[model samples]
Target: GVTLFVALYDYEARTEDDLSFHKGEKFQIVNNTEGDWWEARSLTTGETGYIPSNYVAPVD
Candidate 1:
């Protein structure tokens, strides 16, 4: 069960482990079983890092 998401707004990485993405960028959920932050990889850049779950919306 893979889930895809689109960034709702531009998010800048605050930490080294965080992911930076622009609005409308798509990402693949790597892991979401954690807390507010989820692991994801950028669809455009193939870079993986943490992104706030609330910052993105699920893509149907």
Candidate 2:
């Protein structure tokens, strides 16, 4: 089961554990059980980190 998402806006990583992404970048959802941040892997870089859930939209 693969869930994809697209960034709605550019987000800079505030910490080492945050995933920095530009608008329109795609991600693969790793974990979504958290509250505000969700774990995801970048489709372009293959990097994984916590991303603000509100910054992304489902790629349906």
Candidate 3:
């Protein structure tokens, strides 16, 4: 079974231009992206970014 998880931190970006996930913000899985990158959009805004496959923990 497939389950979803939300960003649990007010995280800052670690890449060249790191992004953030304010506490309580949510994102959904954007599957089937290139090179095993999973994308997601911020719940408060339409901002989206690529996330590593191992970064996400499937709750299912």
Candidate 4:
């Protein structure tokens, strides 16, 4: 389990419940071993889905 922040926008929902987030949103990193993609949970909406790792930034 890891915490990361969103640094990009995802207008196209690649997951359920329009699982898209805007910049500065926080998410709980779930699966990050998928190469370019990572699974995470939105702290804002409580939605879980896959997003590009580039869309998020590592927490300091």
For lDDT, the strongest prediction is 2
Which segments of model 2 are wrong by more than 4 Å? none
CA lDDT, every model vs. true structure: 0.92, 0.94, 0.57, 0.71
How far off is residue 44 in model 4, in Å? 0.3
Candidate 4, residue 51: Cα displacement in angstroms equals 0.9
Error of 3 at 52 (Å): 6.0
lDDT of 3 by residue, 1-60 (tens): 353546555666777433366655666666534666567666567677755545455544
Model 1 C-alpha lDDT versus the unseen true structure: 0.92
Two-way lDDT contest, 1 vs 3, winner = 1
Better of 2 and 3 by lDDT: 2
lDDT of 1 by residue, 14-53 (tens): 8999989999999999999988899999999999999999
Candidate 1 wrong stretches, greater than 4 Å: none
Q: Please give the distance, in angstroms, between residue 28's alpha carbon in candidate 4 and its true position after superposition.
A: 0.4
Between prediction 1 and prediction 4, which has the larger lDDT?
1
Q: What is the TM-score of each candidate against the true structure?
A: 0.93, 0.93, 0.53, 0.72
Looking at model 3, residue 13 earns an lDDT score of 70
Candidates sorted by lDDT, best first: 2, 1, 4, 3
* Evaluation by TM-score, superior candidate among 3 and 4: 4
Q: TM-score for model 4? A: 0.72
